[PDB]
C-alpha cells in the first residue's frame, strides 16, 4: 500500500469492463423487476458496520453466487470467473490499504504473540494463563475508550 494516491479507479473500470462482458446474458435472463440489492444494504455500507457488510457481500458473490452461475451455465463460466478475479484483485488492494477494509486485516501484535506462544510450547500455556489478568486489564483498558 502506497497510501493509495488513487490507483483504485483503474480497478473499478476493470471490474465494470469485466461485467459488461456478461451484462446482456444475465440482464436478458433476469425478467423480474424488483430490486434484490435493496438500498438498505447501501445504508449498511455507510453505517459503522460498513466494512463487515462489504466483506460479507464480496464473500457472498465469490462463494455462493458466481460459483453457482459459472457452473450452471458454462457458456459464461469463464467470462464470470474473470469478473471474479477482478473482484478478488480488488478486495486484495482494498485491505492492503487500511481504512477501506480493516475488518479483513490480522493484528500484528496478536501474530507475534501467537508465535512467541508457539515458540514456548509447554511453558506457553502456563505464561498465557498466568498473564490473564494482564489480558483483562487490556480488555478493560480497551472498553474505557
Amino acid at each position: 500500500c502506497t497510501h493509495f494516491p488513487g490507483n483504485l479507479p483503474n480497478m473499478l473500470r476493470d471490474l465494470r469492463d469485466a461485467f459488461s462482458r456478461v451484462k446482456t446474458f444475465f440482464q436478458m435472463k433476469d425478467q423480474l423487476d424488483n430490486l434484490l440489492l435493496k438500498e438498505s444494504l447501501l445504508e449498511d455500507f455507510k453505517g459503522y458496520l460498513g466494512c463487515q457488510a462489504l466483506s460479507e457481500m464480496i464473500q457472498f458473490y465469490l462463494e455462493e453466487v458466481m460459483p453457482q452461475a459459472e457452473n450452471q451455465d458454462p457458456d459464461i463460466k469463464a467470462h464470470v470467473n474473470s469478473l471474479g478475479e477482478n473482484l478478488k484483485t480488488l478486495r486484495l488492494r482494498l485491505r492492503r490499504c487500511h481504512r477501506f477494509l480493516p475488518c479483513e486485516n490480522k493484528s500484528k501484535a496478536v501474530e507475534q504473540v501467537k508465535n512467541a506462544f508457539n515458540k514456548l510450547q509447554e511453558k506457553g500455556i502456563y505464561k498465557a494463563m498466568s498473564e490473564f489478568d494482564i489480558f483483562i486489564n487490556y480488555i478493560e483498558a480497551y472498553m474505557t475508550m
Binding site: 479507479p9 483503474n10 473500470r13 465494470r16 440482464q27 423480474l32 424488483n34 430490486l35
Partner: protein
C-alpha cells in the same frame, strides 16, 4: 396470420440528460402503423405507457427518466399498433443505467499566450437537467479527457495528449498558423464510451 410482428429490437442511445429510445420497424410496415412506448423504473413492477402512438423510430424519454443518475435504471418496451391489433412487446435487452450513457463535453474555449495556448473544457449543461444534477456533481471524481491537436495549414494529422483537468495548455513550440482541437471525455472508474467534440479552432494569426 392475424398476427402483427413485434419490433425486432429496442435500445437506448443517450448522452447526459438526452435519453433517446430507439427501435427497428416491423417488416413491411404500412403507414397507418405506429408504436406504443412504455416505461419501467427498476424496483417497481409497473409499466407506464408513455406514448400511445408514435409514427417514428425513436422517442425522447429524458423527461420521464430525469432521476436516472440517482436510480438503479430503467427498462423500456415497444410494440406495434395498427387498427385494433398490436404486437408482443419488445423490451430492451439491458437495464438502461448511467453505465449506458455516452459522455460528451459542452464546448471548448481556446486562448493564445506566449508559447502556451490555454484550453478550457465546458462540461455539458443540458436544459432538461435539474440544477442538483451537474455533470461534476454526478461524476465527481476521475474525470479525464483525451485531446487531439491538428495544425493548419497542414495535413489531417493529430498529436495526442492526455489530461485529467478541464483545463490544459498547448505548447506553441515556435510555429504559426491555426490550431484545431477536439476533446473526448471519460471517467477513470467508469467504462462509459465517449464522443469527440466538435472541433474548435483558433487563428494564432
Amino acid at each position: 396470420g392475424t398476427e402483427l410482428p413485434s419490433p425486432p429490437s429496442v435500445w437506448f442511445e443517450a448522452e447526459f440528460f438526452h435519453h433517446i429510445l430507439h427501435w427497428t420497424p416491423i417488416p413491411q410496415q404500412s403507414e397507418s402503423t405506429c408504436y406504443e412506448v412504455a416505461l419501467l423504473r427498476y424496483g417497481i413492477e409497473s409499466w407506464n405507457s408513455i406514448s400511445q402512438c408514435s409514427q417514428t423510430l425513436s422517442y425522447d424519454l429524458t423527461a420521464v427518466t430525469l432521476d436516472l443518475y440517482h436510480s438503479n435504471g430503467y427498462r423500456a418496451r415497444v410494440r406495434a399498433v395498427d387498427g385494433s391489433r398490436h404486437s408482443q412487446w419488445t423490451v430492451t435487452n439491458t437495464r438502461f443505467s448511467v453505465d449506458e450513457v455516452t459522455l460528451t463535453v459542452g464546448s471548448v474555449n481556446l486562448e493564445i499566450h506566449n508559447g502556451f495556448i490555454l484550453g478550457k473544457i465546458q462540461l455539458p449543461r443540458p436544459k432538461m437537467a435539474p440544477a442538483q444534477d451537474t455533470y461534476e456533481s454526478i461524476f465527481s471524481h476521475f474525470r479525464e479527457y483525451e485531446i487531439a491537436i491538428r495544425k493548419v495549414p497542414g495535413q489531417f494529422t493529430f498529436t495526442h495528449k492526455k489530461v485529467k483537468h478541464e483545463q490544459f495548455s498547448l505548447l506553441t513550440s515556435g510555429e504559426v498558423g491555426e490550431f484545431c482541437v477536439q476533446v473526448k471525455p471519460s471517467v477513470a472508474s467508469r467504462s462509459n464510451k465517449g464522443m469527440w467534440s466538435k472541433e474548435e479552432c483558433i487563428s494564432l494569426t
